[PDB]
Write a protein that binds this DNA or RNA. Structure first.
Lengths: 63, 310
DNA sequence: TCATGTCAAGGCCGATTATTTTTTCCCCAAAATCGCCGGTTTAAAATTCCCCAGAAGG
């Protein structure tokens, strides 16, 4: 979940010719994570989750 | 050399291949050598730690470390440690919590004890100090920024955000303080902090370091602590409250009765950390509300105002 | 002593608890990249050895 700026920085510094491992060191990210993000379309910073059960569900129709 | 300066590419094989494409008649391996001193100086830079100049930062840090039942009420004890970098001296105090007002109070106490201010102050990520950091755009606060400008220092919270090079030293000093002090003055945390201050003045700030072999107090004395403004930026909670047409308002669960002119208008309550409430309306100051330790119901306040008007 | 407005609910914010996802750290194995040292090759510089002319001494 590296933010827009983090992903932009990773992609740019990698494409400039800078080595990937020291890129990860500089940005404080795991080498596997950085390498995976190298070949990625756009910055991933969103997680989608659907609704979940609550306590007032059985009573909701009655209310 | 320019490639390293600009692109920071300390890759030796790659640079040799590039210049070979550019017409290099030399050998990969001596370029590997040459780029080694470069990347080795880079690794020296990586290992560069403890770049503390006299009066640079006071290494602020907060942490909940204790729990007490003060006056029969459970409360979590929060400790603040400001370590003065080069000198290695540190001001330590654990009072109530990690609220911003107590943070500023502790900073003021540390400045008074050190008799001045450093160039900048380095904090740790938390709810206070900075509300939120967005891709380097660190918007700390408005009141906190005003306080920093008033005292002179500036916030520079950029420590390593990992357990390495930040957590290691933090926990080291934390448990070193906990074990060496381990004091228990009395149920009242205020008395505990009083004995903590005595212990700090006795065997903490006057405890020579094994490596340096000199008490940090001398370095603190020789450090640059620019004179503090000699006055304290207000350490009182500021909070607005609307007055009902009854000439009444509320604050922290207690309801106060104002006069006719104040009904239907927004007053500003200012509460020192001391524990006294002062009501400021439209810039001016209004009559004190004779705050009392025992809580009185709104009915008793109405009765009191009735008798007073009688 | 007269007369004299009062109480409850809703909304919002903060803190705490519970659940899910992401990132990091440590240990082990394999592959790739980088660094250092040694050897070889190429280019440049230094020293010594033979014959012609000039100068000095007996």
């Amino acid at each position: 979940m590296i933010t827009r700026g983090e992903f932009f920085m990773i992609k740019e510094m990698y494409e400039r010719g800078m080595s990937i491992s020291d890129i990860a060191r500089e940005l404080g990210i795991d080498r596997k994570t950085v390498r995976k993000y190298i070949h990625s379309p756009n910055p991933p910073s969103k997680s989608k989750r659907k609704q979940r059960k609550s306590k007032l569900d059985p009573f909701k129709p009655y209310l | 050399q320019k490639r390293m300066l600009e692109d920071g590419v300390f890759n030796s094989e790659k640079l040799f291949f590039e210049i070979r494409q550019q017409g290099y008649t030399g050998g990969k391996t001596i370029l590997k050598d040459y780029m080694k001193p470069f990347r080795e100086t880079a690794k020296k830079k990586y290992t560069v730690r403890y770049e503390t100049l006299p009066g640079e930062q006071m290494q602020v840090d907060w942490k909940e470390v204790g729990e007490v039942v003060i006056e029969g009420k459970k409360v979590k004890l929060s400790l603040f440690v400001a370590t003065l970098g080069y000198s290695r001296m540190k001001y330590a105090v654990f009072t109530t919590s990690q609220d911003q007002e107590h943070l500023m109070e502790c900073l003021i106490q540390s400045f008074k004890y050190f008799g001045g201010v450093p160039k900048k102050v380095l904090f740790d990520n938390m709810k206070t100090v900075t509300d939120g950091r967005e891709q380097g755009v660190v918007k700390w606060n408005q009141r906190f920024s005003e306080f920093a400008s008033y005292y002179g220092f500036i916030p520079k919270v950029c420590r390593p955000y990992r357990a390495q090079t930040k957590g290691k030293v933090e926990r080291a000093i934390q448990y070193i303080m906990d074990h060496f002090y381990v004091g228990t003055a009395f149920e009242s945390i205020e008395e505990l902090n009083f004995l903590l201050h005595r212990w700090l003045d006795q065997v903490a700030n006057r405890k020579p370091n094994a490596t340096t072999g000199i008490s940090p107090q001398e370095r603190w004395a020789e450090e640059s602590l620019k004179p503090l403004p000699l006055k304290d930026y207000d350490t009182s909670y500021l909070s607005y409250r609307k007055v009902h047409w009854d000439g009444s308002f509320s604050y922290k669960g207690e309801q106060w009765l104002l006069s006719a002119e104040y009904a239907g208008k927004e007053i500003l309550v200012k509460e020192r950390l001391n524990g006294d409430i002062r009501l400021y309306f439209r810039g001016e100051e209004i009559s004190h509300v004779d705050q009392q330790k025992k809580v009185i119901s709104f009915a008793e306040k109405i009765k009191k105002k009735q008798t007073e008007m009688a």
